[PDB]
């Protein structure tokens, strides 16, 4: 893998020229007139393109990992982001896409690489900033990296992902993306992030229009005939539902979109993931709210939940039974008065 080593050296050298330049040219401070490096003049995009293509293969990934390929690619992505900012320049967008694709491939299934990339704080900030790119393809690539980093995140990674503002940035991104594949990556990352801590759940719920959008995903209609968006949107909803349950304003947003009625339809889904997410959401929404308790009674929820308590899937079993016992502990007056 001598050519690969050569390509990594090409990009490390280019980064070195960039860092030296950044160090020696602080705006407002005395400095020479030597020009800022441009990646187009050093064949950078072709190099990262070749690396991105090789990174699909586990054998080339092994050879990259021995050579420190992840750090070299991350450093290039970071430095181009710092030098040029949010640009629509095709060359810059293309190099950042290819760098991100490689980072996605190099983090997949790879505990050590995820840890390394999260430790690159400057790179993590650069990644989060790219979610505002006008290139939806770049947004998809960045969300893919964040999805992988957020999966099985260690304590340090969880903290870094939170501190760089990935949650708010991804939720805001979700509200505007057009393609299903971008949305899949963005919601998958959010499904992972929303399980990490209470603060991430709050941050999602705080974004203007986020809850309505998540409720909307429960009835998303895939043009590719998959259930990935309903599963991920519903998975985020389940994870933040513990907070929704104690916020009347947020419950009202759900009501305006007939959320409870949709979750009951989800109990009859042929997808266990969809059923599980619905059971988890109902577990929370069925607690400590007379209005939504009565609504669930009225919509026949008791029988639907009772149907699931023998399931044998931990979360369907747990959630269905917890929702059922909430409803049974809170039989509405109009049922009690009617005997």
């Amino acid at each position: 893998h001598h050519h690969m080593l050569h390509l990594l050296e090409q990009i490390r050298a280019y980064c070195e020229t960039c860092w030296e330049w950044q160090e020696a040219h602080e705006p407002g401070m005395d400095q020479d007139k030597n020009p800022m490096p441009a990646p187009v003049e050093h064949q950078i995009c072709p190099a990262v393109c070749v690396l991105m293509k090789l990174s699909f293969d586990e054998e080339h990934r092994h050879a990259m990992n021995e050579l420190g390929g992840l750090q070299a690619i991350a450093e290039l992505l970071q430095v181009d982001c710092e030098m040029y900012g949010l640009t629509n320049d095709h060359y810059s967008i293309t190099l950042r896409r290819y760098a991100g694709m490689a980072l996605t491939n190099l983090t997949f299934g790879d505990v050590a690489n995820k840890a390394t990339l999260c430790s690159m704080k400057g790179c993590m900030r650069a990644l989060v900033a790219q979610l505002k790119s006008e290139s939806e393809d770049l947004q998809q690539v960045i969300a893919s990296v964040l999805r992988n980093l957020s999966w099985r995140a260690d304590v340090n990674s969880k903290k870094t992902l939170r501190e760089v503002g990935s949650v708010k940035a991804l939720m805001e991104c979700a509200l505007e993306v057009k393609k299903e594949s971008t949305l899949k990556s963005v919601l998958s990352a959010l499904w992972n992030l929303s399980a990490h801590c209470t603060e991430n759940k709050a941050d999602i719920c705080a974004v203007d229009g986020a809850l309505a959008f998540l409720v909307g995903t429960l009835t998303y209609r895939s043009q590719t005939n998959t259930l990935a968006i309903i599963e991920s949107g519903g998975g985020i909803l389940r994870n933040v539902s513990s907070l929704i349950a104690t916020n009347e304003d947020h419950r009202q947003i759900l009501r305006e979109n007939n959320c409870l009625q949709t979750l009951l339809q989800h109990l009859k889904s042929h997808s266990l993931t969809i059923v599980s997410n619905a059971c988890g959401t109902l577990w929370n929404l069925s607690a400590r709210n007379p209005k939504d308790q009565e609504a669930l009674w009225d919509m026949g929820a008791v029988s639907m939940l009772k149907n699931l308590i023998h399931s044998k899937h931990k979360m369907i079993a747990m959630g269905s039974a917890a929702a059922l016992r909430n409803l049974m502990a809170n039989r509405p007056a109009k049922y009690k008065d009617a005997n």
């Binding site: 893919s144 999966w151 990352a189 992972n192």
Partner: peptide, 11 residues
């Protein structure tokens, strides 16, 4: 739960 998983890059 973290149901989001992980995935390779889209070609």
């Amino acid at each position: 739960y973290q149901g989001g998983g992980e995935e390779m890059a889209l070609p």
